[PDB]
Amino acid sequence: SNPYNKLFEERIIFLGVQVDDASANDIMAQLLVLESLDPDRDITMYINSPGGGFTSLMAIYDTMQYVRADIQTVCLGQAASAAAVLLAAGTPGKRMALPNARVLIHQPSLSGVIQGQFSDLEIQAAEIERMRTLMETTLARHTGKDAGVIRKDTDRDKILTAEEAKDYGIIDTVLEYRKLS
Amino acid sequence: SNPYNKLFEERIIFLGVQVDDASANDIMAQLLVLESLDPDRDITMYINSPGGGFTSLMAIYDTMQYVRADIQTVCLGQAASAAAVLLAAGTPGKRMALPNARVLIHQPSLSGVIQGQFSDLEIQAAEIERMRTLMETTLARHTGKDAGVIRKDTDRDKILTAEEAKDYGIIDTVLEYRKLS
Amino acid sequence: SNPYNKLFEERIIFLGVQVDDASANDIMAQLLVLESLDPDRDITMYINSPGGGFTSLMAIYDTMQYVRADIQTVCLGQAASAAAVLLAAGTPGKRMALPNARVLIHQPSLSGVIQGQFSDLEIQAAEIERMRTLMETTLARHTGKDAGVIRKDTDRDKILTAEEAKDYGIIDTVLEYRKLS
Amino acid sequence: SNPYNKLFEERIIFLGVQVDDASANDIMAQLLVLESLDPDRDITMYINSPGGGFTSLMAIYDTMQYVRADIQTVCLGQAASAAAVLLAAGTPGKRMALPNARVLIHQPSLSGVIQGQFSDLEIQAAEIERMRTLMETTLARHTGKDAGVIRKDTDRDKILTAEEAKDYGIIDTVLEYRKLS
Amino acid sequence: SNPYNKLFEERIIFLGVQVDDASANDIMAQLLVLESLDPDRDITMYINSPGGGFTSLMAIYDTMQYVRADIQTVCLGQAASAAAVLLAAGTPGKRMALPNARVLIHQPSLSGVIQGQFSDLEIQAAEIERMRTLMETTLARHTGKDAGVIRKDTDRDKILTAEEAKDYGIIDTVLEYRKLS
Amino acid sequence: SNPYNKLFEERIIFLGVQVDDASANDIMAQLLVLESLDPDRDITMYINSPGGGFTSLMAIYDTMQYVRADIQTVCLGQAASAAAVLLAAGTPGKRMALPNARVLIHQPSLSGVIQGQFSDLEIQAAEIERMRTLMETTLARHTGKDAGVIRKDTDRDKILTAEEAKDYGIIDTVLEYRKLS
Amino acid sequence: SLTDSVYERLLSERIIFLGSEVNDEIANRLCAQILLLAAEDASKDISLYINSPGGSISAGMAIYDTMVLAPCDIATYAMGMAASMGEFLLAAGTKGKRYALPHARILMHQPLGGVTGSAADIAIQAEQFAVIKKEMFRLNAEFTGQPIERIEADSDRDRWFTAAEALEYGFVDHIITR
Amino acid sequence: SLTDSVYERLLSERIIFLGSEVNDEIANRLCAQILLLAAEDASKDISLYINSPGGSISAGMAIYDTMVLAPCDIATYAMGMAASMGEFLLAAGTKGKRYALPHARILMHQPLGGVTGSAADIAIQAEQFAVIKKEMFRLNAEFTGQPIERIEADSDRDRWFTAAEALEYGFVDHIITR
Amino acid sequence: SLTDSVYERLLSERIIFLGSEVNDEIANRLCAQILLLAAEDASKDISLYINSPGGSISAGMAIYDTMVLAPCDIATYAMGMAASMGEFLLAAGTKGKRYALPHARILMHQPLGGVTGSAADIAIQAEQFAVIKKEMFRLNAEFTGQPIERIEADSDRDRWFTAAEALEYGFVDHIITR
Amino acid sequence: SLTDSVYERLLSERIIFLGSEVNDEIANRLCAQILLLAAEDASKDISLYINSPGGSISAGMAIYDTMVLAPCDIATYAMGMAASMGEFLLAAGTKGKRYALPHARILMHQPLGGVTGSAADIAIQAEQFAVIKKEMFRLNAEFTGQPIERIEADSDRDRWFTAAEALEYGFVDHIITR
Amino acid sequence: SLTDSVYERLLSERIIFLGSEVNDEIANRLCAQILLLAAEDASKDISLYINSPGGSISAGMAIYDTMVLAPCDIATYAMGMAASMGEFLLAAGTKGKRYALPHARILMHQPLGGVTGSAADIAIQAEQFAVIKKEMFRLNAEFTGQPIERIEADSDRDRWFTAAEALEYGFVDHIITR
């Protein structure tokens, strides 16, 4: 079997560039299946992604918190926007990142049910404020920072290094390199 | 086997973004197969979708009510428009949603047999009133609200939170998070 | 195995949106195979479709009547135009529909051998009258209504509810819901 | 296995809408394989098609006559133009059609090696007369009608019903329906 | 297994419409494999094709002559242009054709390494004369006709019937039909 | 298994029209795998191709010389431009070609890292002179001709016949035909 | 453009052509031409030539009100089709000046309105359409001298009139022969 | 545009060309040109040059009625094809002024009408077509001086006439040579 | 458009260019230009410059009959290709006025007619083509002063004539040098 | 179009530009301009400005013969490229009037002819090409005052001449400086 | 076109704009405009306004030689970018008449030449490019009054000059303020 499938056998979910609502459903399907196979074993989620739709990433967030097995999160590469919520969402003591990892706190982009309401500007601006509120609130619950602080940083597109992400409360540890020579 | 297929083995149907008449047939095929495999075991349907065609979602609704096995419904993410009917349609005591789930009551969009009748405006407006009547009636049967109340909310695009959805009669419980740390 | 294939094992043919001459051949292949596997066992055909080409749906009609095994028909969702003939064509006592099913009697659309004859208007209008005659005649043989009555309704795009379809002779029974709570 | 493959196991070739030179080769491959598997067992060919290229349908015709096993032909739906030759080509006593089957005798369309000869009009008109001669001659050998009679009907796009096709010599029997109720 | 694969098991290569340099490589791969599997058993090549690139058809020609197993050739349908060389190339006593087969002797079309040389007209005209010389020479070696005779016929697009092809030296026998009634 | 895969089992690599950098990697993967499976057994490479990118064909060249197993090369059809280097590169005594094979010595085309440097004309002309130098040098090492001689022929698009290719040092033998009649 | 050159020369002869669609773009072009000709000289007639399958009901009404406010008689001619709004316009020319050529075909029928927007909007557009259509039928009854009941019985069917029948019915006052 | 410039200069010489299609767009352009020339000077003839495969039957009838109402003789010339409606028009020129050039080819045949809309509409369009076609045949019989039975026997076959035959048959009064 | 401006200025000098295709559109444009120039002043010559690969046989015949009926001498020049119908036209200019430039290339050959329609129509188009082509060969024999047998022997082969050979053969009366 | 406006104003100053391609379309446009200017006033010179990569050999010959028959001196200027047929034309201007600007680049080379049609046609086009090319080389030898052997030795190589070299070689009579 | 109308009105004021690309098409348009203005009145100056990223080196040289041969002073203005050939042209205006506006940006840099054709052609185009570029640098050294070594040191780097720096360097004689 190809990797990804070997990774699934090892209870590893790899979250990549496919961040459409359509793929969010695959991540949720993977979490639901790994929990039923063995509720007492950790699930590792690797994150390397340029954010994604906020609505579907919140659906993943609730699934991750719903599931009984601990989920640990590892940031490889990128954890932009909304993926930073999913990174912070892992079980405390198990949020990890590699040294050149970058966590990017951004306002969520407009997506979800934006089908074609007439007052698109009043409605979509309202959806944006709601999404920003959820991102700020959700990160505050998982990082320890007041939502007001998170907003100030979110509004400025603050980008955190793997070490800064610890100080900001997203990462518990920065993974060491293992140099054999 | 990949999830989705593992989910089917566990009697779980995952209803996502594929909400075309063509996919409605797949949901019905899954319900018909799970019932014949074991009529006495519950079927879990996970719902995360931006509505869909009303005509084909009503075809699913009748299949769900036809089937002898209890169907329980879980809203992950979205249950827009017409998917809210399918969410309400699960067996009472078994309609569930995650906290950031949003149930969106909207008038059904125009679809189905809209092949090219000459008087498209008189006919399609008539189809719309019929579809609205079915949505309002169907939700009233499953939520306890008078169809007249549902119409007032439907006409205003009311969006319900997972908790509001209980008060509105769509959800029996809001699923708890399981925080291990 | 995925449903549809499980349905075939159970002798169920699911007729959906794929109503092209190319797919009519698949339905006929399925009927021919199920009959040879066991000529004495019923075949269930589920119908949910926006009509289709008349010529190829008549080819299915003859195959259904040719086959020794009883074919029972269930309307889920739609049975528009020409699919209503196939619905009526099931063995009497075994034509069934769900309550929100709609059977739509329409004149057949122009298809089949319309390759590019010079006098397309005289020829295609002649094909249309022939197709209308077959639809009216075929429904009369299976519904009990005079072909003249069927024509009057066909010309007005009459749409039948699952209950009206019994009165009109297409459906023998309307399937009950099985509410467990 | 899916039908078509089950049909092949039963020595049934299903000739449909795929009537390109590319698919003619598949029909010939199927005839060559069924003969080698068992030269003494009948091959059933089901025909439902809007004609096709004449050149490649004649290649099938010769393969059918070359093969030692009897080939029986059943017209389902259409047997337009050139497919009527293949229908007539089955072993006498075994040419069959369903009641709503239509056999359409038409002049063959222009295809085959029409690569881009300079004098396309003189050459292609010559190819047309040659193809018409082969169709008329081939049907006369299998129907009993003089080629001159066939030409008169061919030139008028005569369409035969399943019963007329017996009188015209293409069909030996029209298949009965089997009504169980 | 599907035909074509059953045909390969029986040591049959079916050469069809796929006559690109890319597919010429598949024919050569098939000849090389059949020879190694059993060098003493005949390979049957069925030919039904609208010529193809001359350069890649000559590559097949050399492979056919290189291979120790006898190769017999059967023309079904077409053997246009360059395919007539491959037809003539089979082992003498084993070149065969069906009665409605047509062998078309044509000048080879321009292909191969025509990448974009500046003097395309002088170079490509030179390639054409070289290709014509090879076709004329190769057919003379396999048909018995002087290359000068072949040129006179080639220049006039002479098309041979299955019987004429014997007189012209391409076919040793014309295959009989096997009429069982 | 299909040929190509049967050819791989027999340690045969078939190099065709797919001469992109992307496919060069497949040829290298095949050489690396065949060597590890059995370092002491010959690898046969069949060549029939319209050159390709020079940079990736040199990557194949080094892999071929790196590998411990003898590689023998057979030219079928074409060995244009850069493929002539790979043909010459086989182990001496084992470079072979069929009689209608043509080896085309051409200057290499522009490819590789041509991403969009500003001074494309000075840089790409420099890459061209470097590539020409490698082709001339590499052929001299494998053909015995001085690189200066090769340049004179390369600049004139000299095309070698299978016999001329022996005199020019690319081919050790021209393969005989095996006529059985 | 020969086509536009010919129409400008004809516009100077006070002749306007309606050759297609009667959509919003065509209605605005015709309204502009009627207003222009009336502005240039209100003492003279305008001749409107119709050969059109028809179009949107609201577009046809814009043309009609412009024809009415313009202070000049408008003659109308059916020179092929005068279908749906093409008929409405034909019939709306002034009395004694509605003409048809012998092979003209007049179709009194209704527009389809057209469905656009969300389900919520479609349900509203349909009411405005029903109102406009009711006025179209009232006006056709007045133009032809028929009971409104006949206008509805005929407009709800695809009933074509020959030029001779169109005259008898009241759409046309005269048939032009030579 | 040289093409449009040449046609405007010719229109001023009272020459109209029908070079293609005879569809609704072409018919409206020709109708506009005939009306314009007759309006400019009704005392003079209009020369119509035809080189066309033909087109829709209703488009050809619109041109024909315009040719008839226009108060001026119209001469017609077959200068290549005069096929289907192209023949109808050719034959519809006035008597003594229908011409063909020696290598002209005249095809009396019928239009196909054309199939559009739903099955319900196609079945109706066919009746209107049959009616128009019957009138086309009556008029060709009158134009050529033939029994209507011959017009049908020949128009239902793809029967081409040489310019010399077209004259004998009555489509053309004179062949132009020099 | 400089291109169209230059051609209008040349048309006023009574010069017509045939630079491509000889399809139905080109033939109608050239026919219109010949008729226009003859109408403007029939006492003067028209000069036709040809540089064309040729085209449809029926298009070339339309141009030819127009050249003949026009009451004015037409001079023709081969100023590159005069191939197929381009040759027919070149050769059809009047006698003493057919010219070629020294590097002109004249190809007497036949058009291919062209295959369109259903098999039933193709079989008919071919007969009309054979008839037109037979007339093309008769006319080339008359234009060049050759037996028709030579016209067929040469037109059925891709036989190019140099300007000097074209003169000897009779396509051209004079070669223009300076 | 400023571009076309500028060229019309220049054409009135008897200046013609060849800025690209020398394909059949460009050759016909230039031939038309040369004929027009000579027709307007044959007592005056025409100045041809060349900045072109070249093109088809037959297109270049059409321009050349037109330049020769036109009864007026033609001056030619290389104001960038004069490549292939661009050189042929440059060199074909009259003597004492062939000019190059100092940074002009002149390429004596051959056209590629171009491959079109079936293998049977390609083999024929190549012979006509070889004949035209042989004449191109003869003419370049005459234009430059070189042995034909040098013209072939240089035209078969991609040999660029600087403006100063082009003068020494005989393509250009003068270099224009100020 | 307002854009072309404005430029024609400006061309009559003897003002030429170079707003983009300096490709072969732009160079031919500018060369035509310079030649036209000088032809209309050689006693007056031409003002060239430059706002361009630059382009092909051979296109810029065609414009430059035309500027030089034209018998009239040419003033040049940098009114945004004068990059690469845009700078070459700016600097090539006559002395005392090279201007920059205060926010102008001047980039002395080299063109890339451009790679086209087969590997065999690319290797040749590069030599012609190297030769043209060497001349570009010699001319910039002469235009600015710099050692050629500085021109190379700066042109081989993406070194932008402010308008004030461009004046000090010698590209510009004056800065225009008001």
Side-chain angles (χ1 to χ4, degrees), chain A residues 15 19 21 24 51-62 80 82-83 86:
Chain A
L15 174 61
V19 296
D21 292 352
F54 188 74
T55 299
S56 70
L57 292 170
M58 287 301 293
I60 292 168
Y61 171 82
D62 287 349
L86 295 177

Side-chain angles (χ1 to χ4, degrees), chain A residues 13-127:
Chain A
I13 298 171
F14 197 110
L15 174 61
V17 300
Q18 299 296 332
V19 296
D20 193 85
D21 292 352
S23 67
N25 287 332
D26 295 345
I27 299 298
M28 290 188 283
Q30 289 178 66
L31 288 168
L32 292 169
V33 172
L34 291 172
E35 184 177 14
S36 69
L37 290 170
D38 186 341
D40 293 325
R41 290 179 65 192
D42 292 359
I43 298 170
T44 299
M45 184 180 290
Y46 287 96
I47 300 172
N48 184 30
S49 69
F54 188 74
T55 299
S56 70
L57 292 170
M58 287 301 293
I60 292 168
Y61 171 82
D62 287 349
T63 299
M64 289 174 68
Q65 299 302 302
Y66 178 71
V67 169
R68 289 173 288 179
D70 275 339
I71 301 169
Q72 64 179 359
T73 56
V74 178
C75 181
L76 307 175
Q78 298 174 51
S81 185
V85 175
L86 295 177
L87 179 59
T91 299
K94 299 181 180 176
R95 284 87 57 88
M96 296 169 279
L98 295 171
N100 289 288
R102 298 290 180 271
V103 180
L104 299 79
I105 307 302
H106 294 287
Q107 294 185 4
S109 65
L110 181 66
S111 191
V113 183
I114 56 168
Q115 291 174 325
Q117 297 86 323
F118 174 82
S119 297
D120 62 344
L121 184 58
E122 291 175 349
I123 293 167
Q124 293 172 2
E127 288 292 299

Side-chain angles (χ1 to χ4, degrees), chain B residues 107-108 118 120-122 124-125, chain G residues 110 112 114-115 119-120 126 129 133:
Chain B
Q107 294 185 4
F118 174 82
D120 62 344
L121 184 58
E122 291 175 349
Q124 293 172 2
Chain G
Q110 61 192 324
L112 49 73
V115 176
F129 177 73
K133 183 170 75 175

Side-chain angles (χ1 to χ4, degrees), chain J residues 118-177:
Chain J
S118 69
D121 298 302
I122 293 166
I124 296 168
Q125 290 175 341
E127 182 64 17
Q128 291 296 306
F129 177 73
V131 173
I132 295 166
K133 183 170 75 175
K134 184 176 179 180
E135 290 299 318
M136 182 180 172
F137 293 166
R138 178 182 65 81
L139 290 171
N140 283 340
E142 292 177 359
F143 294 159
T144 63
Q146 297 293 331
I148 196 168
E149 294 82 0
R150 289 181 179 169
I151 296 299
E152 291 175 353
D154 292 315
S155 73
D156 202 44
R157 297 186 294 158
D158 191 7
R159 179 180 177 177
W160 286 93
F161 293 84
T162 65
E165 291 173 326
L167 185 149
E168 184 176 3
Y169 198 85
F171 295 104
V172 173
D173 298 304
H174 306 287
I175 306 301
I176 299 170
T177 65

Side-chain angles (χ1 to χ4, degrees), chain B residues 28 55-56 58-60 62, chain C residues 47-49 75-79 98 100-104:
Chain B
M28 290 188 283
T55 299
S56 70
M58 287 301 293
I60 292 168
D62 287 349
Chain C
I47 300 172
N48 184 30
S49 69
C75 181
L76 307 175
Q78 298 174 51
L98 295 171
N100 289 289
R102 298 290 180 271
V103 180
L104 299 79

Side-chain angles (χ1 to χ4, degrees), chain E residues 93-140:
Chain E
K94 299 181 180 176
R95 284 87 57 88
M96 296 169 279
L98 295 171
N100 289 289
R102 298 290 180 271
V103 180
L104 299 79
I105 307 302
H106 294 287
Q107 294 185 4
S109 65
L110 181 66
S111 191
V113 183
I114 56 168
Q115 291 174 325
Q117 297 87 323
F118 174 82
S119 297
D120 62 344
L121 184 58
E122 291 175 349
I123 293 167
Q124 293 172 2
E127 288 292 299
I128 291 165
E129 292 297 302
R130 183 180 66 80
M131 290 188 293
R132 289 170 70 200
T133 300
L134 288 171
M135 185 180 289
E136 292 162 356
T137 300
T138 301
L139 288 170

Side-chain angles (χ1 to χ4, degrees), chain A residues 155-167:
Chain A
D155 287 347
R156 295 179 291 162
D157 295 316
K158 186 174 184 178
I159 300 174
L160 303 166
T161 65
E163 294 78 10
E164 289 173 328
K166 287 175 60 172
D167 288 345

